[PDB]
Structure 1
């Protein structure tokens, strides 16, 4: 696993990418690690944002599937040609698999201007694969062709430049401290989990637990913020406002539209509360909690090429599509995607940033009744 440690790189807010090789002879590409999608889709045309792109025709092991794919989302679409080719990960397991590859020939608002990645590794399940669930995802192809165990674990470490580790086929003990606790994957499509309880400095948020998972709660490496449903976001902010009422901040700060600055390098971490998220456990009526520090949700401002000091951005935002546990959560925790056993493990990361008096935690067990009722149908 030592060869797989520190195999992730990226820029702040632009995601985490891993080095991958496709085709014969091998073409080296930087590929976004994405637990929020299920397609292995790489740029295959010279879009001006891209450093590199996949050249289908120069690979002797490339096979044209003779079928297109069209993936629209919100502000954009990505599209291209479906095919298969030989894929390997230089700083991964020593194997080569024939996997599905979507050669992106056109996209709108997909690639990020200034980033160093040229494609995405959809690490989620077949059901959200496009055009349909018969297009086998990369990790499915990996496990079915090799003896690599059906799991991977992510340690995202966040610093402009960021690093991390994607351990494929196991768990590295030295990437976490304390104990690993597991939450069941509710449904195999996104990495869907169930939040049963939320606390702010120990104070229960007092919401119907169905609100925390409306209409969904996912673990996504392709998202930066901790995104919460409107009604949950409202209460959490109102609670964070209350905990830190010794200082008032502009209304735009809570919306992520304005920055807040203190004389470097202190900085009142103490007035900001810890946020505990209770997740459904492996056992009936059993749950566990993950505690995030003010240091996870107050991020040093991305691009301050004019504005020095300390300065911060509020990294909790509202969502209309359910809870998203992004880098805000994931950078605080070593996250194990145990696909073979339908579960996701959380343990305090060895690379999380802690303050002088408080510590991030994964603790349990807790008694929580009707946890299944917190999931939305």
Structure 2
């Protein structure tokens, strides 16, 4: 009840490949590493020997498997998985001491879904039923967990990272050792993705003076399943233009800002020429907001596997989007993030583990006065 020591440090991963938790599926239990994804709502796992997979769900061995006799084709903007739907017994060894009958999509075909060299063989969609495939009748895992057990309807994520990353996913609660200062809550605007409303943006304290509605076009979401802070092209333009201006003692190729090239130094990174980035999020109270600030340490990520270079090369991990803002790993790694489903809100605090230097720190600050925040939501 504020201390979940068993669950601390239960996230593992590799830079650029995401965070995974260990899960078991079936009877007797088959252990699998499962990507933690707040951007989708399906629990889907490798079920055939795709050569990139360390292991896979073997239904024939599970005595508790049930077939739903339904299939599902799930495409993304590059590329896809296809699966056979069913149920089985699932548990999280370094999570609550419980077993749950949940929906499972057994992946039988894919393209560009499994990553070569990755050490995970499935995905845990933790978002809501509205975006479940094939439809909202297919209950997501977390919903099933809460319904069948006494686990409270809340989880929290401390994505730390830095070739291997680490973190904690606290199921059913909050662990206070994971954050400093105070949690600040922003409303979940609708229960499909974890949608939130950005009401103001600053670069090094400087506003952007954009219609806040632009910031949330057509959506702003919190997503552990994406690396980048992804922005709508308009906001991206204004953002980069400002980041360029804040940054203009060094010249960088246009391709770097566009994610088309890496930039390398040899630990001689001029972190301090790079501005901090602040997003004000709708608060809990009318005309009240709060501020989250990330460092260049978050949006400039080291690219490990460059055979062609002996130096330290970095990627600009702020990119343009057509699905609205994606608050991904670049954002979340600054913070302890509480997905308070019970109260339709998302909490942020400074991560006890976030990476910084002796000059600037990731911050969560409040309160602020911000009028017309409702007009910031897109309809």
Shift of 1:110: 1.1
Give CA-to-partner distance per residue, 1:239-285, whole Å, 9 cap, x none.
0110111110011110112222234x232222111111000001111
Shift of 1:347: 0.5
Give CA-to-partner distance per residue, 1:138-178, whole Å, 9 cap, x none.
00000000000001100011112111110101001011111
Give the RMSD, CA atoms, in angstroms.
1.0
CA distance in structure 1 between the partners assigned to 2:168 and 2:127 by the alignment: 18
Q: 1:161 aligns with which of 151, 160, 164?
A: 164
Q: 1:117 aligns with which of 117, 120, 140?
A: 120
Contact 2:146-2:153 at 8 Å conserved across structures: yes
- Partner of 1:16, secondary structure, is strand
- 1:51 maps to what in 2? 54
Contact 2:304-2:313 at 8 Å conserved across structures: no
Give CA-to-partner distance per residue, 1:102-123, whole Å, 9 cap, x none.
1111112211111111110010
Give CA-to-partner distance per residue, 1:40-91, whole Å, 9 cap, x none.
1111111111110001121010100111112122222211111110000000
Shift of 1:234: 0.4
TM, length-normalised to structure 1: 0.98
Equivalent residues, number? 376
- Partner of 1:153, secondary structure, is strand
CA distance in structure 1 between the partners assigned to 2:179 and 2:236 by the alignment: 29
- 2:234 maps to what in 1? 231
Q: 1:66 aligns with which of 63, 69, 73?
A: 69
CA distance in structure 2 between the partners assigned to 1:109 and 1:269 by the alignment: 34
Give CA-to-partner distance per residue, 1:289-335, whole Å, 9 cap, x none.
00111111111113123423333211111111100001000111111
- Partner of 1:158, secondary structure, is coil
Q: 1:272 aligns with which of 263, 271, 274?
A: 274
1:19 to 1:360, Cα distance in 2 relative to 1, 3 A: same
Shift of 1:192: 0.4
- Partner of 2:168, secondary structure, is strand
Contact 1:13-1:302 at 8 Å conserved across structures: no
Structure 2 residue ranges without an equivalent (≥5) = none
Of 308-317 and 345-354, the range deviating more from structure 2: 308-317
- Partner of 2:331, secondary structure, is helix
Contact 1:151-1:170 at 8 Å conserved across structures: yes
Structure 1 residue ranges without an equivalent (≥5) = none
CA distance in structure 2 between the partners assigned to 1:104 and 1:372 by the alignment: 41
CA distance in structure 1 between the partners assigned to 2:250 and 2:205 by the alignment: 21
Shift of 1:355: 1.6
Give CA-to-partner distance per residue, 1:188-220, whole Å, 9 cap, x none.
000000000000111101100000000000000
- Partner of 2:342, secondary structure, is coil
- 1:170 maps to what in 2? 173
Contact 1:152-1:168 at 8 Å conserved across structures: yes
CA distance in structure 2 between the partners assigned to 1:353 and 1:77 by the alignment: 34
Q: 1:337 aligns with which of 336, 339, 344?
A: 339
Contact 1:253-1:260 at 8 Å conserved across structures: yes
- Partner of 2:343, secondary structure, is coil
Which aligned segments of 4 or more residues in structure 1 are displaced greater than 6 angstroms?
A: none
CA distance in structure 2 between the partners assigned to 1:259 and 1:54 by the alignment: 38
CA distance in structure 2 between the partners assigned to 1:359 and 1:55 by the alignment: 46
- 1:356 maps to what in 2? 358
TM, length-normalised to structure 2: 0.97
